[PDB]
Ligand binder design. Structure first.
Ligand SMILES: CCCCCCCC/C=C\CCCCCCCC(=O)O[C@@H](COC(=O)CCCCCCCCCCCCCCC)COP(=O)([O-])OCC[N+](C)(C)C
Ligand SMILES: CCCCCCCC/C=C\CCCCCCCC(=O)O[C@@H](COC(=O)CCCCCCCCCCCCCCC)COP(=O)([O-])OCC[N+](C)(C)C
Ligand SMILES: CCCCCCCC/C=C\CCCCCCCC(=O)O[C@@H](COC(=O)CCCCCCCCCCCCCCC)COP(=O)([O-])OCC[N+](C)(C)C
Ligand SMILES: CCCCCCCC/C=C\CCCCCCCC(=O)O[C@@H](COC(=O)CCCCCCCCCCCCCCC)COP(=O)([O-])OCC[N+](C)(C)C
Ligand SMILES: CC(C)CCC[C@@H](C)[C@H]1CC[C@H]2[C@@H]3CC=C4C[C@@H](O)CC[C@]4(C)[C@H]3CC[C@]12C
Ligand SMILES: CC(C)CCC[C@@H](C)[C@H]1CC[C@H]2[C@@H]3CC=C4C[C@@H](O)CC[C@]4(C)[C@H]3CC[C@]12C
Ligand SMILES: CC(C)CCC[C@@H](C)[C@H]1CC[C@H]2[C@@H]3CC=C4C[C@@H](O)CC[C@]4(C)[C@H]3CC[C@]12C
Ligand SMILES: CC(C)CCC[C@@H](C)[C@H]1CC[C@H]2[C@@H]3CC=C4C[C@@H](O)CC[C@]4(C)[C@H]3CC[C@]12C
Ligand SMILES: CC(C)CCC[C@@H](C)[C@H]1CC[C@H]2[C@@H]3CC=C4C[C@@H](O)CC[C@]4(C)[C@H]3CC[C@]12C
Ligand SMILES: CC(C)CCC[C@@H](C)[C@H]1CC[C@H]2[C@@H]3CC=C4C[C@@H](O)CC[C@]4(C)[C@H]3CC[C@]12C
Ligand SMILES: CC(C)CCC[C@@H](C)[C@H]1CC[C@H]2[C@@H]3CC=C4C[C@@H](O)CC[C@]4(C)[C@H]3CC[C@]12C
Ligand SMILES: CC(C)CCC[C@@H](C)[C@H]1CC[C@H]2[C@@H]3CC=C4C[C@@H](O)CC[C@]4(C)[C@H]3CC[C@]12C
Ligand SMILES: CC(C)CCC[C@@H](C)[C@H]1CC[C@H]2[C@@H]3CC=C4C[C@@H](O)CC[C@]4(C)[C@H]3CC[C@]12C
Ligand SMILES: CC(C)CCC[C@@H](C)[C@H]1CC[C@H]2[C@@H]3CC=C4C[C@@H](O)CC[C@]4(C)[C@H]3CC[C@]12C
Lengths: 257, 257, 257, 257
């Protein structure tokens, strides 16, 4: 990409900019990204406890990785005049977000917890720094741009599927919310979200064979195969036709681009 | 679409017509459709019981939504001279159907149940008003027209698959209807529909491995691997080949259109 | 198709031939095929027992259907001079086969069982007469010719998959034939065919998670994750990559033709 | 392929070379490859024990097959001047590897075990000689070259999927490593590799529904559906979008080539 809107106020901008954007620095920063991800994985495997053994190790290790990423972000923003809205606005925004969260956790971990502790969920976004790798390795950036363009179509397919699942959830609560009168009804179709969750399980292959009772469906008279029809129609329509519609969207975009 | 057959008998027809067909009214009615669907879902989640708590709420809420949809249908039909066979015959037919069922339930819910109670299944078609949304949101109407054109070929594939499943059901009933002599035979292959249902379960991943007994298949002599051949051939031919034939039809149409 | 090799020896051949090949007779024979298939299904559902109730009904019903199909085959072969190798050789061969088996069972059922009883497996080919329907209904014949051309390429994929599955069965018998020292080893990997069958189950989604024991894989030292690698590699390669290779072949042919 | 770099030092090279490369010798060696694979399978089925019955049989049988393959490799290398780097370098390299391992096992099995016994894993590469068949049967070599070119893109898709799985593995150990306080936490999310393995099981259809406890998710207040969101998002994004991305890559290459 050509830098056209980022005019040069800074003394050495054109030099530092094309220094950072060089493929050597890109692959060195990809090295740092992958090593920091492997450091997170190593913390979670060799020391997952709440009362960590090598606690310092992980504290100072992510301290060092985060200050290196802060230095890299400063190099970048010096490169394009700290604007980051003109050139590479999306990736610069993601970089700024992750480095801000990291430096916030750093400042609080060394100099006292200023933020509430239930904010601690954000102390789990370190793992997402790895997504920046999908910008350097172009074999990965290829798949990611194909995915990012297949996303609107896929999302539309998902919304249609969600609406159909909701209709089944609405019906399931109407019909089967009293079977077993926790019964099977009261628990798997008790309310709209228990039913929506039951149908999502069934959608991904969770054996809706306990819902249908063969003695009642077959041994009884010809009026009680309603649940058979319910689950057969759901399976066919949602799982076969609509998941393959999502597939079709995915493949059409993946082979068009 | 151009209105060509709907000649103007009514005083203000050309004005009210293009008023209703304007994108603003389309998105307002999409708002009403989605809010009424969410009202159905809210009734089924926050009050699913047979002796409803906030009954009055759901009764008057669907009263109001249905009278608004009746007003909208009257606006539309005034727009095209109450014909609804010339312009947009399919969607106007669906609108008329759902609004008729709704107003029937309204009249009976406020002024006494004129219809039989076992007719009550139709009091569950409210949930399908949401399908009218697939006419306004064109990202959804796109997927729906692609599906509606892929449905002929897909239906043919399903019929071939059904015929193969029926052949297996006949064979299964003929052979394995006496295993365990409810046994496994009597119940999973007892009659043609128990066998057809067993094979539909197996088709969607329900662990046929209880049908095949390893001691009998392997420990016994080399004559008893019939059920292994049965289930392996069924799995291969129906599951792999024919469900991927359904997929192939789906993708061919989804990428052609 | 044009009849070019079937020269006319018979007195009224050109008339009877294009009488049989007319679309009216084709759809009447499709009616007879579907009704006879539904008669087989009705026998298996409403009377599956070995000591049939309405025996006489099924006996004389398939008697009548088989004599009608014998009359139809005679009409056809009179149509093309009893050659059936020149015109429509494949479908005429299938018709001759099924009608021969049917008339054999007829002659033995009315006039004594001339053949051995363990030949009785062929008395189950009635169900396959339905395949002749795939010649009349052209929406089905379309899917069937696309399948029949995708078969030589799907078969090769299946052979590659089988070869890969035979390698994993050899390795499974080599390694895991002694676990649990019926144990899990001696039963699921005991010999080459128990292992091949275990891997076919696992291939179609049968929960390999009982093979891998988490205490042994994780609690023990770093040398015992061999079965994890075995099943992860099998799943990836065979299930994902090779079943989607079969899919790819299927879709390429289904959209090319 | 034309031999252009393999100049002729040997007396009869041009004759023996095009003798070996003739289709007759290729199909005879395909016969030997398939028969030796079936000999391995027969050893594993009819004699899988550690104290083999017909031990000699298998010993001398693989002796004979390996000396025949050694003779064939010598014929080949005499054909192209023992270079095997100029002509058909990949397949000649694979042939040399497998024949070297075989002759090593032969020499040690007849004249004493020179190598360590824990090297014995290589005594299981006989099964992979069958891959050489994928060079002779061109219907198989076709599928294999299409696969070999789809492997770069597929590998990239797998790496993206692995990174997402790792991210879920890092969040799972963070959150659910204390549920049940072996518990469910301490076993299915205990460390990073238990969590990565749990998510790989779930990815291939292993019933996450035991992780999510419906009483806690629904009966409790509206704060505890975190695991529902975890597993629903994992299923959607990895199981539905990313495995179909792998499919899409596979199909694009399989239909392009
Ligand atoms: C959500 C899906 C995003 C995938 C495409 C995003 C994209 O186009 O990258 C844009 C960058 O803009 C960014 O800031 C990227 C930030 C995350 C991208 C990588 C996430 C991988 C998700 C994978 C999970 C699959 C998600 C499936 C969920 C249904 C492209 O910008 P550019 O052209 O490089 O400039
Ligand atoms: C059977 C499957 C139907 C697929 C969609 C219909 C096809 C179609 O062309 O819509 C037509 C509408 O015609 C109508 O009148 C629609 C009336 C209700 C159906 C709405 C489709 C959404 C439901 C099923 C959603 C997924 C379930 C389907 C999965 C099997 C298009 O008409 P038009 O060109 O807009 O004028
Ligand atoms: C083997 C698979 C055959 C399927 C396609 C038939 C081939 C064909 O073209 O029919 C030929 C007819 O010749 C016949 O006799 C057809 C026999 C009936 C086939 C119906 C089986 C469909 C389902 C099986 C599923 C297969 C899955 C198997 C998994 C590997 C076409 O002849 P024509 O051009 O009409 O003249
Ligand atoms: C990996 C697939 C390799 C495809 C071979 C490509 C090739 O051209 O063969 C070359 C070398 O060939 C060899 O030396 C070994 C060939 C191994 C084939 C095994 C296929 C198993 C399918 C594995 C499924 C993949 C699962 C992995 C999931 C990522 C020869 O190429 P050529 O001279 O053109 O002939
Ligand atoms: C590619 C590389 C550079 C990425 C970084 C990985 C390194 C730095 C991480 C990954 C796993 C970590 C090691 C694994 C766990 C242990 C065992 C413990 O008793 C001492 C710390 C120690 C030894 C860690 C040190 C740091 C470590 C080695
Ligand atoms: C592509 C399709 C399958 C989308 C899947 C539908 C999703 C949205 C469904 C499946 C299960 C549903 C969840 C079931 C469980 C609960 C508990 C409820 O107290 C809060 C909402 C919540 C969290 C639901 C949100 C919507 C939900 C997550
Ligand atoms: C996507 C669209 C087509 C939804 C599927 C069409 C509708 C009509 C299908 C889906 C599930 C089916 C229902 C499932 C089973 C029952 C229960 C029984 O007591 C009455 C019939 C009834 C209610 C079926 C009627 C038809 C049905 C409602
Ligand atoms: C504007 C759209 C998105 C919302 C749909 C219409 C409105 C009226 C729907 C959305 C959610 C629904 C509410 C959900 C919660 C309840 C349950 C009960 O405690 C009082 C009624 C009440 C408050 C419902 C009233 C109707 C409701 C407010
Ligand atoms: C694979 C797809 C395309 C084919 C679908 C197969 C369908 C038609 C099969 C699967 C299970 C079968 C059902 C099994 C249960 C019964 C009970 C029986 O007393 C009435 C018929 C009925 C309801 C069957 C109808 C046909 C059926 C629903
Ligand atoms: C044209 C092709 C696809 C026809 C489809 C093949 C299916 C329908 C048929 C062909 C041969 C049949 C097999 C032949 C006979 C046996 C042995 C019997 O004791 C168990 C069933 C079993 C194993 C049959 C299963 C069904 C079967 C596999
Ligand atoms: C994945 C697809 C394409 C390959 C199919 C694999 C087939 C050939 C495998 C799966 C299970 C295997 C069977 C396992 C059971 C037995 C019992 C044995 O005593 C006779 C052979 C027999 C019948 C095997 C034949 C081959 C077999 C059927
Ligand atoms: C299809 C081709 C490319 C893949 C070849 C599969 C081979 C390379 C893979 C698949 C299964 C793997 C084996 C499965 C697990 C074990 C058990 C352990 O005791 C030794 C390692 C060993 C034996 C692995 C070695 C590598 C392995 C054999
Ligand atoms: C979805 C596909 C593409 C990604 C594959 C994920 C693979 C790499 C995951 C799934 C399960 C994981 C394994 C889980 C079990 C262990 C035990 C641990 O003590 C050694 C590592 C090892 C062997 C892990 C290696 C990585 C692993 C094999
Ligand atoms: C491409 C994908 C990775 C996009 C990002 C996925 C992330 C945002 C999704 C996947 C799983 C989700 C998490 C799963 C459930 C929980 C547990 C709860 O205690 C806090 C919310 C939290 C932590 C969710 C936050 C958002 C989440 C982390």
């Amino acid at each position: 990409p050509p830098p056209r809107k980022v005019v040069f106020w800074l003394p050495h901008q054109r030099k530092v900019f094309d220094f950072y954007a060089s493929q050597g620095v890109q692959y060195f920063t990809a090295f740092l990204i992958v090593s920091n991800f492997i450091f997170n994985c190593a913390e979670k495997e060799w020391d997952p406890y709440t009362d960590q053994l090598y606690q310092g190790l992980w504290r100072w290790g992510e301290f060092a990785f985060n200050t290196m990423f802060l230095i890299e972000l400063l190099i970048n923003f010096y490169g394009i005049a700290f604007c980051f809205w003109r050139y590479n606005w999306a990736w610069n925004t993601f970089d700024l977000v992750v480095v801000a969260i990291g430096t916030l956790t750093m400042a609080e971990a060394i100099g006292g917890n200023f933020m509430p502790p239930s904010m601690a969920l954000i102390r789990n976004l370190r793992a997402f720094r790895i997504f920046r790798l999908f910008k350097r390795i172009k074999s990965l950036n290829k798949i990611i741009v194909s995915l990012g363009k297949a996303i609107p179509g896929v999302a539309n397919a998902f919304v249609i599927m969600v609406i159909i699942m909701c209709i089944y959830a609405i019906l399931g609560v109407e019909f089967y919310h009293m079977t077993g009168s926790y019964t099977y009804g009261e628990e798997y179709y008790g309310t709209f979200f228990r039913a929506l969750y039951t149908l999502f399980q069934v959608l991904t292959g969770e054996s809706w064979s306990e819902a249908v009772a063969r003695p009642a469906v077959f041994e009884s008279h010809y009026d009680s195969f309603g649940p058979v029809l319910f689950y057969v129609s759901f399976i066919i329509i949602c799982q076969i036709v609509l998941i393959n519609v999502v597939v079709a969207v995915l493949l059409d975009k993946m082979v068009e681009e």
